[PDB]
Structures are given as structure tokens and as C-alpha cells.
Design a protein around this ligand. Structure first.
Ligand code: SF4
Ligand code: SF4
Ligand code: FCO
Ligand SMILES: [Fe+2]
Ligand code: NI
Ligand SMILES: [S]
Ligand SMILES: [S]
Lengths: 277, 482
């Protein structure tokens, strides 16, 4: 089971919580059978500098072979002080510092959630922390490690687990270098795996006939008409929610309300106002 | 033994980024400082937006308690917009939000706190840990703890299915908006909610509440520490009618042995020890300002310091159960007698010392989970399948509104001011803000800082009780800072 470190920047822990909702494999099976989650601040047993030093000990031994998950954006303003993630030997560790430390040595970096993938809400208009997407931060700092974006606010658990499994299966078919190249091949131009993000919501929406006919709901609770006039961003959104749905298949955003385009690189500002077209 | 400073960063098995620094002298904590180390600035991000967007944006404060923020936001918007939420939409909202209380408490006890007392399997992320972790449970009770941790992973996921039935998805519901709830409950989906609820209820009554008392009975010393100020706040939550006057949790303040009403005008947020501009200190939320100052000398946290009439108060399940003083659960009363020799009927029969303690906060959270079962059962009987749940109000040109509720971790309020049909100001005063804040402008510690005083550290190389105390308050630093 390959070692995984899960670092949280400017995240809300929603990307961790969504993962806990994985149905098959369950999160228990993910943690005991699929990955070795060596560092994760929300769930791990140890704490503080001991947890940081444990991650550093694993990283030293498994240099080039561990997977680094980033949840949340990386704020660069004020010398990184808007996100301090730990302290070891009286030296504070910012998210900037941590990504520069571990990023170069990971097999691959999985930018989980729209914040990590694209900046998201912490980077949106009115912010002032210099919130930066993982791939941009790494590129700006000359770090060439492969990045895979798994966006959504939050992502569906199946997108996170499925991307992990796709990468691990690819590595066991073609080795580390070969397998990472196979993964690159199934990424779209926004770095997203096409199994989950290759199809447009609207083109696959059950209300498409109503859109084409001009039949629009005027209240949220009218479930017959298309949701476009209520603000649905499905026409601009690439995700498979229409099929997989959410939380054990019990609902999804378009059925319940509207799609807000949460997986898209312009979320939230280019998807807002949410409740008009 | 002498004097030792211990810094813990990150404090793990909480939500968010927290550093705790304590001074230990002669085996006990004698000073403490808590530092919320991550800032996003939702209060400035929200400015200039369509006010209806707030009930989506604000949920991203926190993916553990997004329904609490959604609720406070839509209540503020309802007031600002003049929207009259239909009765059935009020009940639907309560079903969406109540299901996440169950999720959050179960997550907290098992997946965040239980490893403080239970040794997990011999694999990451359950090892490595402190060599002397003070894990006292028998082989059989420890195995029960692990089995329940594993089962709880399924139970908390089912709670999120409950949230999503009428909320759309979780984390980050789509189903609450200004004016009500976006999806009318159908007969068929109410069957689905109730079937899941039955499974959750059975786990809460048969496993969770018993295990908290049973583990507690092996850590009876943990009822004798962590009192802090012994002062509590509740702002009220879960409207039970459409008049705004009866709630499942009723508001109140408790301090220095006295009960008093809650008056929100008495809230001020201080920033002397927080990374915000000095000129913004001491403001009530209706005039709140958020101007980061990450280089300000002497400050140590991105959490502001809220005070109620100058008082440093705590929030959360203990606060609500203390203020409201309901009857204890039948199983709790039985186990208090069987395992502790304690005769108790009402919550306050625990006594102030044992209630305001490390283990008392875990007990309070389990008892509150039980209490929520009856509320949700009531709402499932009260809801009418098929009855409309939303109105569609226009955006007002100029308005203000405040939403008050109780998030799983304690009191939450959102204040919005609308000008020219856009957000002019938006201020959040959240639960872990009340608990995990730094000193105020007078030098008075925050609630958890004060509760750390006296915590035993008999082994400075294995100072496990520092974070055990912190975890009892279920901190969420994403919420505290926003
Ligand atoms: S509801 Fe949304 S995704 Fe579906 S047809 Fe209408 S605009 Fe397209
Ligand atoms: S339906 Fe739209 S808003 Fe909902 S999860 Fe999918 S992409 Fe995100
Ligand atoms: N519960 C929760 Fe979140 C916190 N602290 C809020 O408000
Ligand atoms: Fe605030
Ligand atoms: Ni929270
Ligand atoms: S939270
Ligand atoms: S919540």
C-alpha cells in the first residue's frame, strides 16, 4: 500500500469529509487495503512535531514514491503566513514551505478540490491572501512533479478514490514512469481525469428536453421544468453528477436545486450569481 | 519538576489548523496560548456579491458544519429579504440540518476523539503515536472501541445520505435558500430518510451513548480537570414554530453560577492578540470589520476574541445542555448509577465541576446526540409530504438581517447588510471562535486556553492530556477564522 501524505492548506476539510463518504470501496477499505495514509491532520493518531517528523521520515525512505494530496489553496502573500501547517524544532512550516519541501519528491501530487486545483473560493474576488492553485505554485517555483487535478467543491468521493485507483492500476501495469504517463494521457486541458470530467452535465441532463423546448421552472420546487432561469450552470460544467449522483445516489444538485459549476476553473466568480443565468 | 514549554502544531484530530503552546510547572499546565494559523477572509470575499450567493459561499467556511453556516445565512437573508418561510420549509430545513448534528457528533467522538482512549489497528493512520499514550481500556473494551469506530464510518456516511435526501448533496448542501427549502419532501423520500434514521438512532442508543459513559468510567480522573471559566453561551436553535419564539435549544448565558438572558448587543470582538488591524478592536458584529494584519506585534492567532459583556464564555453541547438543563437520557442515568455510583436526573445533576470537565464535554455531546433523536422523530411526524417549502423573494435594494443558530460545536450568527442590492458587509461569529480564541484586549484568555489551566502533564515526554482537553471541545479552526 503506497504511502500518502494529505496536506491541508486553505481548505475547509470538505474534501476530507467527502472522501469519508465513499461507498465502494468504503473508506475503511481505502485506508486498510488501498493506501497507507501516513499523515493526515484530521484523522491521524499522533500530533504536532512528532506527526511532522513521521511524515519526513517516510518521505526520506520513500523519496520519489509517495503520493502527495493537497486540499485547499496555497497562500503566498505575507511570506506564507496566512497558512501555517505545523512547527518542528521551533521552526514554523507554512503551506508554501511544505509544498516546496515535499512537492519535488512526490511520485505525483493530487490537487483535490477546486481550491487546490484552481484557487477556488479563497482566490475569489475580495480575497487578499494570494491564494494560489497547486499546479501554478509548483510551476512558478520550478517544480516539475506531475499534478492531477480532482476538482469539485467538494469532489464526489468516487472522483478522488477513482483517480487514486486509476493511477495505482496504471503504475502496476507499466511501472512508475510508464504509469504516470498513462495517467497524463487521460487528463483534459484543465488537468482533470476524463473518466469523471470528460462529459458535460447539460448534454446529459434529464431536463435537456425542457431546455430545448423553453420550459423553465420559476420556483425551485417546480421539478418539471429546466433550471436554467433559476441559475443552473450545467451548460458550462464538465462532471458526471447526472449519472453517479451524490451521497449513495440519493440526490444531486440539478434535481434538488441548481448546478453551481463547482468543478470548473472559474468557480465561484465565473459561475456567480448562482441564482440567475 | 520545573518549567517546560510545549508546543503542539498541528494539533491533530480536530478540524483545521491549530497550534497550542502550554507552560507546564510541577506536572500541571500553568499557562496556554492557542493559535489559529490559517486565514481565508470570507467576510471580505463576500462583499459586492448578490446576497443570495452567500448561502452557497459561506458553507465553504467549513466542510464539517456547512449546514450550520447555510442555516445562519438563510435566516439572515430571510430577515433582510422579508421572506416568510413556509411552515413545511421550516421543517424541511430542520431535517436537513438535524441530520448533520448526528453526523458531526458521531464523527467527533469516534473519528476525532476516540483514539485518545483507544489503540487502533497496527497501521497508518493509527500508528505511530506517543510511546506512553495512556490507553487504559481492556483488550475487550478496546476492541469494542475499534469495532465501533469502523461501524461509525458507515453510520456517519448514512447521516450524510439523510442530509442529501432534501439537501441535494453533502458536504455543501444545495437545498437551503432564502425563502425556504428547494425540494418538497415526497412520501417516498421521507420513507428513505426514516429508514436511514432508524439505523442511526439504533447505533446512537445501543453503541455510542453507552460507550462514552463506559470509556468515561475508565477515565474518571478526566471529570476532575478542564473546568476553565465554567461559563456558557447558547443563542438558540431549531425553530419549532413560525413565530420565532420557541426553539429546541433555548437561548441563555450561564456565568459565575448565575443564569441570565442572551442579549446579542453585548457581543464585542477584540483583536489585540489577533492578526487584525488595531483600529478594528472591540466591535459588535453589526459594525464588524475584517482587516488582516499578519505582521502585527504581539498577536498570535487569526481567531478574533469574542466577549459577552466582557466575559469569556464557551459554547457547544455542554453549553447548550447546561443552559437548557433537559432530563438526561434513560441509558445515561442508568450508567451514571451502574458505573459511577451517581444518582442523576437532570443534566445539571452532574454538578458544575463534572459537567465542565474534559470527559464531561464528551458526555454532553453524546447526551445531546440522544436529545436530537427525539427532535428529528418529531419533525418526521410534523412534515407534510407534498406541501410547498419555498417562496421566491426579490433581492432588496437596502436591508439588513441576522441569523442565529447553534452549530454542532456551539453558537453561530451571520449578519448581512445589503446596499445597492449587493452585500455591503457580512460578519460571522462562529462556535469555535467562542471556544478557541486568544486573549482579549484585557489579557483574559479564551475558553479553551483557560480550560487548559490545571491539566495534568505527569510525563512531559508524553503530554497527551493537552490535546485530549482541546479535542473535548471539538475545535473547528476553519469555522473559528473563516
Ligand atoms: S437543468 Fe441545467 S443542466 Fe439540465 S437542461 Fe436545464 S440548464 Fe441544462
Ligand atoms: S451537479 Fe454541478 S454543482 Fe453539483 S456537484 Fe456536480 S458539478 Fe458540482
Ligand atoms: N459546528 C461547527 Fe462550525 C464550528 N466551530 C460553526 O459554526
Ligand atoms: Fe468573523
Ligand atoms: Ni466547522
Ligand atoms: S466544524
Ligand atoms: S452543521
Amino acid at each position: 500500500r503506497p504511502p500518502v501524505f494529505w496536506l491541508q492548506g486553505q481548505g475547509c476539510t470538505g474534501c476530507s469529509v467527502t472522501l469519508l463518504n465513499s461507498v465502494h470501496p468504503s473508506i475503511a477499505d481505502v485506508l486498510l487495503k488501498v493506501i497507507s495514509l501516513e499523515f493526515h491532520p484530521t484523522v491521524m493518531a499522533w500530533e504536532g512535531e512528532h506527526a511532522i517528523e513521521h511524515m519526513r521520515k517516510v518521505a526520506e525512505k520513500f523519496k520519489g514514491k509517495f503520493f502527495l494530496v493537497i486540499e485547499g489553496s496555497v497562500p503566498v502573500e505575507a511570506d506564507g503566513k496566512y497558512c501555517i501547517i505545523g512547527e518542528a524544532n521551533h521552526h514554523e512550516i507554512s503551506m508554501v514551505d511544505a509544498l516546496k519541501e515535499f512537492g519535488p519528491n512526490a511520485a505525483a501530487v493530487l490537487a483535490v478540490g477546486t481550491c487546490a486545483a484552481y484557487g477556488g473560493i479563497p482566490a475569489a474576488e475580495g480575497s487578499e491572501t494570494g491564494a494560489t492553485a497547486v499546479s501554478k505554485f509548483l510551476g512558478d517555483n520550478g517544480i516539475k512533479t506531475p499534478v492531477v487535478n480532482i476538482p469539485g467543491c467538494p469532489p464526489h468521493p468516487d472522483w478522488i478514490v477513482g483517480t487514486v485507483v486509476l493511477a495505482l492500476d496504471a503504475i502496476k501495469k507499466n511501472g512508475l514512469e510508464g504509469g504516470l504517463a498513462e495517467v497524463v494521457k487521460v487528463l483534459d486541458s484543465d488537468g482533470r481525469p476524463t473518466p469523471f470530467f470528460g462529459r458535460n452535465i447539460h448534454e446529459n441532463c434529464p431536463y435537456l428536453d425542457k431546455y430545448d423546448e423553453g420550459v423553465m421552472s420559476a420556483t425551485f420546487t417546480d421539478k418539471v421544468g429546466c433550471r436554467y432561469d433559476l441559475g443552473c450552470k450545467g451548460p458550462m460544467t464538465m462532471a458526471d453528477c447526472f449519472e453517479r449522483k451524490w451521497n449513495g445516489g440519493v440526490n444531486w444538485c440539478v434535481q434538488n436545486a441548481v448546478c453551481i459549476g463547482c468543478v470548473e476553473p472559474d468557480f465561484p466568480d465565473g459561475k456567480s450569481p448562482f441564482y440567475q443565468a | 519538576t520545573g518549567r517546560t514549554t510545549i508546543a503542539i502544531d498541528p494539533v491533530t484530530r480536530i478540524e483545521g489548523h491549530l497550534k497550542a503552546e502550554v507552560v507546564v510547572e510541577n506536572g500541571k499546565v500553568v499557562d496556554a496560548r492557542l493559535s489559529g494559523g490559517m486565514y481565508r477572509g470570507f467576510e471580505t470575499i463576500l462583499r459586492g456579491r448578490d446576497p443570495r450567493d452567500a448561502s452557497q459561499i459561506v458553507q465553504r467556511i467549513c466542510g464539517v458544519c456547512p449546514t450550520a453556516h447555510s442555516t445562519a445565512s438563510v435566516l439572515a437573508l430571510d430577515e433582510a429579504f422579508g421572506a416568510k418561510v413556509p411552515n413545511n420549509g421550516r421543517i424541511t430545513r430542520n431535517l436537513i440540518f438535524g441530520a448533520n448534528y448526528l453526523q458531526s457528533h458521531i464523527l467527533h467522538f469516534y473519528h476525532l476523539s476516540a483514539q485518545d482512549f483507544v489503540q487502533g489497528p497496527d497501521t497508518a493512520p493509527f500508528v505511530p503515536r506517543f510511546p506512553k499514550s495512556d490507553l487504559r481500556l481492556s483488550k475487550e473494551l478496546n476492541k469494542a472501541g475499534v469495532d465501533q469506530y469502523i461501524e461509525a464510518l458507515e453510520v456517519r456516511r448514512i447521516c450524510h445520505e439523510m442530509v442529501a435526501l432534501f439537501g441535494g448533496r453533502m458536504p455543501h448542501v444545495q437545498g437551503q435558500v432564502v425563502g425556504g427549502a428547494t425540494e418538497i419532501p415526497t412520501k417516498e423520500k421521507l420513507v428513505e430518510y426514516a429508514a436511514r434514521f432508524k439505523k442511526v438512532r439504533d447505533f446512537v442508543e445501543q453503541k455510542y451513548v453507552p460507550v462514552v459513559y463506559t470509556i468515561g468510567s475508565k477515565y474518571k480522573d478526566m471529570f476532575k480537570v478542564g473546568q476553565g471559566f465554567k461559563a456558557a453561551l447558547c443563542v438558540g436553535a431549531f425553530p419549532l414554530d413560525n413565530s420565532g419564539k420557541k426553539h429546541l435549544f433555548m437561548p441563555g448565558v450561564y456565568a459565575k453560577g448565575k443564569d441570565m438572558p442572551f442579549d446579542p448587543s453585548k457581543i464585542k470582538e477584540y483583536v489585540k492578540y489577533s492578526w487584525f488591524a488595531e483600529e478594528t478592536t472591540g466591535l459588535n458584529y453589526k459594525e464588524g470589520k475584517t482587516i488582516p494584519a499578519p505582521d502585527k506585534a504581539g498577536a498570535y492567532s487569526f481567531v478574533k476574541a469574542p466577549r459577552y459583556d466582557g466575559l469569556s464564555l464557551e459554547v457547544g453541547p455542554l453549553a447548550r445542555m447546561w443552559v437548557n438543563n433537559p432530563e438526561l437520557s434513560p441509558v445515561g442515568k442508568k450508567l451514571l448509577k451502574d458505573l459511577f455510583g451517581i444518582s442523576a436526573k437532570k443534566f445539571r445533576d452532574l454538578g458544575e465541576e463534572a459537567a465542565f470537565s474534559l470527559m464531561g464535554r464528551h458526555v454532553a455531546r453524546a447526551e445531546e446526540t440522544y436529545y436530537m433523536l427525539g427532535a428529528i422523530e418529531g419533525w418526521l411526524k410534523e412534515i407534510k409530504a407534498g406541501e410547498d417549502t419555498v417562496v421566491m423573494p426579490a433581492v432588496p435594494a437596502s436591508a439588513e438581517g441576522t441569523g442565529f443558530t447553534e452549530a454542532p460545536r456551539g453558537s453561530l450568527l451571520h449578519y448581512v447588510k445589503v446596499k445597492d442590492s449587493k452585500i455591503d458587509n457580512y460578519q460571522i461569529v462562529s462556535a469555535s471562535l467562542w471556544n478557541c480564541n486568544p486573549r482579549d484586549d484585557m489579557g483574559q484568555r479564551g475558553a479553551v486556553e483557560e480550560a487548559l489551566i490545571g491539566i495534568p502533564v505527569d510525563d512531559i515526554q508524553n503530554p497527551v492530556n493537552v490535546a485530549r482537553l482541546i479535542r473535548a471541545f471539538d475545535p473547528x479552526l476553519a469555522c473559528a477564522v473563516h
